[PDB]
Amino acid sequence: LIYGNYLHLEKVLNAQELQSETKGNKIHDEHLFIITHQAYELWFKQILWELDSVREIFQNGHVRDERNMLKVVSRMHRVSVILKLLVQQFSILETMTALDFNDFREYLSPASGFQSLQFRLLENKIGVLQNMRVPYNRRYRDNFKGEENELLLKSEQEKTLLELVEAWLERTPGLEPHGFNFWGKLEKNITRGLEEEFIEEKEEQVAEFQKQKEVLLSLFDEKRHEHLLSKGERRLSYRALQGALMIYFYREEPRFQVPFQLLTSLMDIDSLMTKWRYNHVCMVHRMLGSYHYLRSTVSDRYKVFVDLFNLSTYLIPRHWIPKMNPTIHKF
Amino acid sequence: LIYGNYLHLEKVLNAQELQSETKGNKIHDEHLFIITHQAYELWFKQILWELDSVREIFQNGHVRDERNMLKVVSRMHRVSVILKLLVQQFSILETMTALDFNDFREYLSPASGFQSLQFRLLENKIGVLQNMRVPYNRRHYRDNFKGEENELLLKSEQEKTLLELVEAWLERTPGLEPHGFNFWGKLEKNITRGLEEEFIRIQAKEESEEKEEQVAEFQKQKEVLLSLFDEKRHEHLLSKGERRLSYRALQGALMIYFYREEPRFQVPFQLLTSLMDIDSLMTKWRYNHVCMVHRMLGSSGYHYLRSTVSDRYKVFVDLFNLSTYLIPRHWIPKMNPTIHKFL
Amino acid sequence: LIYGNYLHLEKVLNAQELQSETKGNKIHDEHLFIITHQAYELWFKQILWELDSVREIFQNGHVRDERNMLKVVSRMHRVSVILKLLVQQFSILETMTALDFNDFREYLSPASGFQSLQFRLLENKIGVLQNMRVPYNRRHYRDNFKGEENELLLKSEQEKTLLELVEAWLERTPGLEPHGFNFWGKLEKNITRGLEEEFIRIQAKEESEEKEEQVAEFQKQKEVLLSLFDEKRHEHLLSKGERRLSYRALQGALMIYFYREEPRFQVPFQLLTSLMDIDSLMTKWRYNHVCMVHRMLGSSGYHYLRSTVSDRYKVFVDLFNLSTYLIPRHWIPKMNPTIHKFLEH
Amino acid sequence: LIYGNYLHLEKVLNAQELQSETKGNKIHDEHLFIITHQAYELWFKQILWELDSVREIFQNGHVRDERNMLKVVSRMHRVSVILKLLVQQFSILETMTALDFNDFREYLSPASGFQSLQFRLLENKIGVLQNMRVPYNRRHYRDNFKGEENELLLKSEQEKTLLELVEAWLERTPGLEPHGFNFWGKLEKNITRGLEEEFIRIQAKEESEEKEEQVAEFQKQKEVLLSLFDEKRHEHLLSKGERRLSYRALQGALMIYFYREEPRFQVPFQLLTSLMDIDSLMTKWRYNHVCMVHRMLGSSGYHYLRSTVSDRYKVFVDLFNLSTYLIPRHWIPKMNPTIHKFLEH
């Protein structure tokens, strides 16, 4: 076995066709354009590789065996690491001036980054929903045809990471009312602590406190949630949300240490996915002038685990957090 | 034209074949290994693209037209930027544990990164010389390569390297002409003078430990500084391969260093800086590679590799070492108005 | 002389006071919070150092001596490099969980990064204009600052900004002189001509939707391209604050863009590129800051900040927008050998 | 409470004294030099903050409560993140040319980065051993430091290092107990067996160059694999300082490596990974430092430093070298339900 043959470089390193050259006027910087995109696509494939694997672990119920949690967090962190690189990779294309890109931009028409099948498959597999997806020029799948359109559909219809994480989050231990009844203990301890606290600048604080109280108690409005879920402003089942907050509050508890890491990485992937979009935009600006559709992609509308980010709003004094009783200290 | 078809993704995204899977026992992390290498190879191709272009500009004498200097420095900086990324790219493969790599390392033998044609072409096109190449397994590197590959690899060694081409251009650097600004002459004189002047300074110091310190500092500096004009020392070191640039080229480089602010020398200096950046980064690549192979294979290619992280692989080491011959600014020959115009 | 004494580490490394600890309940992650900010502030000081130096080079007219161009681009690139780092530095504070920050956030009230004198000095010295600055809680920013601080902050606003100084220099860009190369005239002509020539091409074409599409494209392009020569449109946009550069400065910048390979314009172009890099990175800083305040406080300042990530805080947005007015290379006015002389140093 | 006052910026931003300026000939790039170092020092303080905290968790036996494992790995990862940045931070100082540094290097003598108390404290607290410290021009390291400096430096040397503390904890790693899972025994057996089994396979083959190659490989592997059970070889190497961990600690580490997916070993493995990352990064720091001092001073400290980039400075080299003793997975002693149940929480 030789490197070149192991890596099918006969394919990889014979995939560069400068359209400028194909049309008689070869432009040098076009090479970079091609390579950059090809590298992105390689890495997308790797992310899909990792993601699909993680999805499978959830779907096949392997995640139930908490031995598989190391594997899950490892592969999720790996995604975040690839993404961190893909963000830095824009620095490479920033070496191309707009003036120089202009010299071949025409031979690209009518092509677009939009037509990255993998990027869409990625958005889909994480949990970006078309219902909340910004339409571009009153139009995404329309541009894709064939097996591509077919796969794109499977991607939308098969379980997303969000869905699968939701499922698992719903089964998070300690939610059982017959058990630790976290939610009940929480509502009580908060209401109590609230009242205790509720017993000039005073007025200002009072006003602030009423605002805080509303938010804090908003947590227990199952209906508010269902509504927001419908409007798509939240994404996680109320039960899943409970499991997540369980994990947040009892993270140091051994059974919840890696699960918390997952949540952290899930948020990191959202953060990075959006950083990708941002860097892409800042460039398309520097390259095409005036952008706005893309500036719209950086809107938290594409944050799939936005629920995890927003659990920061509902932070309470440590004192108020239900205690780890002997029984659960065992469990 | 569709993106997928423009980018020949039919090829790119149909090039991943897990040998573990080909042999029945698919290992997940093997995918990463493949992709990582494929990305490296893509980027190598791009670097070769840039480098070959720069070489051509030098060889076809376009570099004489100083309008092409922007293009040259841009493309050279771009190389350094790709390399910066290729160094960071190791962070990705560091996500793979040794334990997990072990689960497929077998299905790789007898393949190695050594068989990267592009990496070799790259080493060669910059200016790595086979004479000063550390032997692998008591043998040459091209021994591992056969066919058109071996053929190309030779062309790469024999065709003009960036070093050679930069040397040529450095030799033509204005200001060296003795009939002109006579930089080298003025320099030798101004250094001789400065040294003497400083000696008197130290002589003035009543004998003390302080004076002693200065004395030692002085003598070492003097030796080094005058070493610069020992054209024979140079020729010797050139032979031993410890330097690489013609003495004339070395003069042009120091010209550029000292008169960098001069408009004609501003971008030329940037080039020199980038040339050094490429060496620095190429070495950082090697270092990160080694640091990983250690984490992955334990402890020995490791030792062979630890050997490749040396000035033997640094092509523009001469540019780095011009830092040793740094002098007080007031010693630097003053740009004569006439030649001040020439620059 | 000792390292520690050279670097006044007696000060630097005795400047960490955890308020949590000062109040009896020391929280560990507070140390990180302090250090991170202190490092940012060190780097801000360095950027101000570089910026002020470059401003002075422009103000004192040293920039006229094109020897100083290397120094200028070097120091400007250095800023962009510091900024690149400052953006990555958020990764450090991302190690702090919101849960853990919550354990000391209280001992901070009412303090805020908003009270970063240096950040404001920086925004100001580059060219952020108060009129373009989104007010927070219906209030100005300097209103939070008092004393010599307010005095400095004012000097920053009143002294020449980099924008102003670059504008001045851009206006003196060679090639614009009508008596000389008359770039703008030649350009208007060459563009008007080219457009006509292209219109004919399209009109020659065999009736199709593709033709219609090209027709549409053509009108759009034509409008934009000719918009360039509407000095009144410019003055209007300047008023609306969509542009920031004088029309003449804009001419000089496009001169440099189009004739960058010309020796005299090689480093000047690099400067333009760096100026844009600084804006890009400054905005990336703001973005990462926001993305974190979200991760930390949830969803409001957050929205104020989300507002700061706009081209309204981009000082050299005009340089970014010169990409809109890109023309076929063959349309660019030709450099006379004789003319190449004023661009050959 | 004001930002500036919280952060004692009266100190931090009044700690820049350009010696060039103090001596009449201010050099611009000296500012950068100062700031860069000051930032490094801030971050070192933070690393020491994190490290000391982790050391205390180990020393005070809090690590026994496996709730505190999350905290430990988090803080150790944070160190690695700071270090990643400190490595990138050299990019900033690379903006300074040697030519320009030369213009002030004189006013620095006789100061040096060597005199970073914090860096030494850091090296010491991790586990760099004074024995294996390469002498600089036949000089010690501590010799340069006097007073409280020397005092603290010693405490750092004498107090428990991270290595020592990790060793302690590694020795208490569950599964090693002979009356329990007897990992070591089961391992030796399973390895001896596997090797024999493989030898037979090769013996069954027909004499050939391939066979010889395999045979040679097999003997090499066998030696290494069985070397693992030579407690005395270890003790010797420990003496020569080629290894650092007790043989029992080494057993615990390999336990963790092999049974990492086991819940009780998942975070512990992460720690090991981060410990190795800290070595890797600490050494990357040294490398980048050297690469620069060369670019700045030419080629000597350079060579002394090139010496610091060795496994002689790698504290957790034992963790790196556990990669040598990797065996087929099927050879690894199996976690029987009963004992698996012991390793859960």
Ligand code: HEM
């Ligand atoms: C010169 C560089 C680039 C330009 C001018 C550019 C231009 C654009 C434009 C204009 C769009 C909006 C759709 C349209 O009107 O066609 C877009 C979207 C996109 N581009 Fe790029 N692009 C560039 C580089 C890249 C790179 C390096 C990638 C890497 C794969 C990429 C991937 C994408 C993706 C995935 C989208 C869809 C955005 C979304 O809906 O999330 N582009 N690009």
Ligand code: HEM
């Ligand atoms: C698990 C990861 C890796 C391992 C264990 C590994 C191992 C090795 C080893 C042992 C060598 C020395 C030659 C030999 O004994 O076969 C080597 C050389 C090489 N590897 Fe890697 N490698 C790894 C990753 C990579 C990657 C990601 C690249 C990217 C292209 C790469 C490129 C090279 C090159 C170009 C050489 C020749 C270097 C020289 O001779 O100067 N390796 N590798």
Ligand code: HEM
């Ligand atoms: C946990 C981390 C952080 C949080 C929660 C945070 C929060 C905030 C908030 C809420 C504001 C808006 C003003 C206000 O309502 O008080 C703000 C502005 C600011 N922060 Fe931070 N910040 C964080 C980290 C940092 C860091 C590392 C810096 C570095 C100096 C910084 C510098 C600033 C600056 C300069 C502003 C004013 C920016 C502008 O108004 O355009 N902050 N921050």
Ligand code: HEM
């Ligand atoms: C122009 C830049 C620099 C130069 C020329 C320089 C020079 C040197 C030299 C020559 C040494 C070897 C000992 C000696 O001769 O005194 C050294 C060691 C050291 N430098 Fe630097 N240095 C630079 C930047 C830095 C930076 C940015 C740091 C950050 C903290 C630093 C920290 C140190 C430390 C801690 C050592 C001791 C390392 C060891 O012995 O293990 N230096 N430096």
Ligand SMILES: c1ccc2c(-c3ccc4c(c3)nnn4CN3CCNC3)c[nH]c2c1
């Ligand atoms: C391969 C080929 C092209 C791309 C682009 C891309 C997308 C849109 C572009 C463009 C380049 N140059 N001009 N435009 C304008 N659009 C507007 C609608 N159609 C043209 C990004 N990645 C690519 C990979």
Ligand SMILES: c1ccc2c(-c3ccc4c(c3)nnn4CN3CCNC3)c[nH]c2c1
């Ligand atoms: C593709 C395939 C393999 C590689 C390697 C590589 C090199 C040497 C390796 C290895 C992988 N796994 N074990 N070894 C040990 N050496 C020791 C002597 N010869 C085998 C790097 N890049 C690759 C790309």
Ligand SMILES: c1ccc2c(-c3ccc4c(c3)nnn4CN3CCNC3)c[nH]c2c1
């Ligand atoms: C030093 C001290 C504080 C900060 C902050 C910062 C900013 C706003 C904060 C905060 C910390 N904790 N709570 N808030 C709420 N805001 C909302 C309206 N004003 C208070 C950032 N950097 C700092 C440096």
Ligand SMILES: c1ccc2c(-c3ccc4c(c3)nnn4CN3CCNC3)c[nH]c2c1
């Ligand atoms: C603060 C102050 C100084 C330093 C240095 C440093 C290290 C070595 C130096 C130096 C500066 N200037 N010259 N040398 C070398 N020798 C050669 C002969 N006499 C001086 C690094 N970091 C610092 C922080």
Ligand SMILES: C[C@](N)(Cc1c[nH]c2ccccc12)C(=O)O
């Ligand atoms: C057995 C279980 N792992 C239960 C579970 C769900 N979410 C969790 C989060 C943390 C810890 C445990 C869980 C499962 O059913 O997957």
Ligand SMILES: C[C@](N)(Cc1c[nH]c2ccccc12)C(=O)O
């Ligand atoms: C005309 C010339 N470019 C001469 C030359 C050589 N090196 C230089 C450095 C800076 C400026 C000019 C030169 C050539 O012959 O290429």
Ligand SMILES: C[C@](N)(Cc1c[nH]c2ccccc12)C(=O)O
């Ligand atoms: C002589 C000049 N430096 C003219 C000038 C202004 N901007 C430029 C850009 C590129 C080249 C020259 C200029 C001055 O007046 O400063």
Ligand SMILES: C[C@](N)(Cc1c[nH]c2ccccc12)C(=O)O
């Ligand atoms: C009770 C214990 N925490 C046991 C222990 C030691 N090393 C470990 C590694 C992984 C898991 C557990 C351990 C202690 O004695 O510290």
